[PDB]
Design a protein around this ligand. Structure first.
Ligand SMILES: Nc1ncnc2c1ncn2[C@@H]1O[C@H](COP(=O)(O)OP(=O)(O)O)[C@@H](O)[C@H]1O
Ligand SMILES: CNc1cccc2c1NC(=O)C2(C)C
Ligand SMILES: [Mg+2]
Lengths: 337, 349
């Protein structure tokens, strides 16, 4: 329990809007990130310490802790530098690159610790819920720190993008690319893949191209995972084409992916988002900027996946976990069953 | 609270499966159960009625409902002394259930009238109304099962065991509920979307889709969802030369009977999706009725969840909406979802 971790964990993370992140396009981002990134690393670090001791003692969770601590300490060092020190700004970018490289394997490492703990230890129902609660928050936390760091790196280190954000993200283009990416893996494994039947409706601007401010990589990640499952279910169940509809409303950008891969019983639909990490992480990407990712399956026929994204950058605000009394109380935590 | 309410509220409701409710039609056994279970269920909800805000309980409407439930609780407790072999007690018990059923006939509109006086955002009121209406659904279910099996005059549908159709023709109920909504839609708009129905029997390919279910409950759910899909479709396409059909797919899987109702009625923002399932919430004004009362979605979801099913709405704002009903395909897993007044419920308030 280093002192810096305890200190910065007492701060609440500061969520940014997609709009703010566009404003990155160096002195201000530097002062903000040297404060905000330790805060977010410190908050999740403290939350790691309340996990079951046998999980925290796994080499994998110990690695994650050590990486996050080292990265926190690397960033806190810049609190002694001036935002006007142009070399400190340059060094700060190199440090974000180092931190990004150090965190490159966080997701599978953490996943390895969870699987090792679940496979080897008894997990009471409360603890199992807390693990899904923790992993949603841990992976959201990583998504957020990676977002903020890459935004600073990409801007101050694609030219048509502002950092990792596309101010006029061609949603349909991303859908088509993510489908093709999944289609390639599907052919490599199944030697055959369903085709894409894509419909687009722009309710906000009829007959006009659908564009929103969004992170295309995040959108690609969500769709890629949903397409992999739709294609794996379609081929194994059977090829019927995966039907996709992209809709832009006043407040929401909606993408619905539909297959006829036989579906799954409602009893098991929730297990899809238990930690098998692609779907839960995909949903985290959707919820990161106040979106959502829902699955509704028709057992015996097929499955619909619907992505909700905010159509306004001002409302696309980071959904960040905070290690405060409420979170700690959720861990401690009417109808007949 | 009378002593009987305090006493019987200490017991937890005993949920029954639809298979068990069918087995009642395979009399003293149902009498022995109901004379105890119905007071317990009335007593549980009577305790929660007191937790409501003073402005709502004191409404003549809620006080009436409370007075009805109390009297029905007392009517039923009168039978605790009788022997299940007393054939006259069994006959009188049927008469009492019919009296309680008739007394409770106007509970929902009375309770709704009470909410109108008290007046969507009240989380405790949503919590209570879910539990109150689920409680009523369950007590009406149990009483009607006994009445429709053992009464001399109330026989229900000859093909049902009580109110349960062991071979519920799901598609037929869909078509009937769609026509009922179409008739109402035509009255309000002089046009109605057509039905584009698809059925997939993954459990028994190409075979008719039947499950054990309460067709009246299924009809209510579909009727309410069709009323919403038709209204949204007509109004969203009112400047179009035609109406897109409402697409329905009925799927029978190993564990689930799934009904998806898809329209192109413009959808709704994700921001207000949760608000749609709130009582009274309606984009139409409150009537004195196709829409306006704001009970279609929440009550329909109660019916779906009453037997461990569910009802979800997934909307594409600017395009249309998917309403999906999940029902258990096996009667043994179709277990009552019942509220219980305990520390958890009290803490939730
Ligand atoms: N299929 C749908 N398409 C668009 N809006 C819907 C749909 N279903 C429900 N809604 C919205 O949810 C609200 C509540 O509906 P409901 O609970 O059935 O009661 P009511 O129909 O009286 O409003 C409606 O006012 C409507 O705006
Ligand atoms: C868009 N489709 C799907 C998206 C996610 C998960 C699934 C899908 N389809 C399936 O069968 C399973 C694997 C449940
Ligand atoms: Mg309605």
């Amino acid at each position: 329990v280093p002192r810096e971790v305890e200190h910065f964990s007492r701060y609440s993370p500061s969520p940014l809007s997609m709009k703010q992140l566009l404003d990155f396009g160096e002195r201000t981002s530097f002062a903000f990130l040297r404060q905000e990134l330790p805060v977010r690393l410190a908050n999740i670090l403290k939350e790691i310490d309340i996990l079951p001791t046998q999980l925290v003692n796994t080499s994998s969770v110990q690695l994650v802790k050590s990486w996050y601590i080292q990265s926190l300490m690397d960033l806190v060092e810049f609190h002694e530098k001036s935002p006007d020190d142009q070399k400190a700004l340059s060094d700060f970018v190199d440090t974000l690159i180092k931190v990004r490289n150090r965190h490159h394997n966080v997701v599978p490492t953490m996943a390895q610790g969870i699987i090792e703990y679940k496979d080897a230890c008894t997990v009471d129902p409360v603890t199992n819920q807390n693990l899904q609660y923790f992993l949603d928050r841990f992976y959201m936390n990583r998504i957020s720190t990676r977002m903020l760091m890459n935004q600073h790196i990409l801007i101050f280190s694609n030219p048509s993008h502002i950092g990792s954000i596309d101010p006029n993200c061609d949603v349909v283009a991303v859908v088509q690319d993510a489908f093709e990416c999944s289609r390639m893996l599907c052919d490599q494994y199944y030697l055959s893949s369903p085709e894409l039947k894509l419909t687009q409706v722009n309710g906000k601007f009829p007959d006009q191209p659908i564009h929103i401010v969004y992170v295309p990589s995040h959108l690609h990640h969500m769709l890629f995972e949903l397409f992999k499952n739709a294609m794996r279910a379609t081929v194994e169940h059977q090829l019927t084409p995966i039907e996709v509809i992209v809709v832009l409303g006043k407040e929401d950008l909606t993408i619905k992916i539909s297959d006829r891969g036989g579906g799954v019983p409602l009893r098991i639909i929730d297990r899809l988002f238990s930690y098998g990490y692609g779907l839960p992480i995909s949903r985290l990407y959707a919820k990161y900027f106040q979106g959502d990712l829902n699955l509704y399956s028709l057992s015996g026929y097929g499955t619909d996946a619907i992505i909700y994204l905010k159509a306004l950058s001002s409302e696309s605000i980071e959904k960040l976990p905070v290690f405060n009394k409420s979170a700690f109380k959720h861990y401690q935590m009417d109808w007949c069953i």
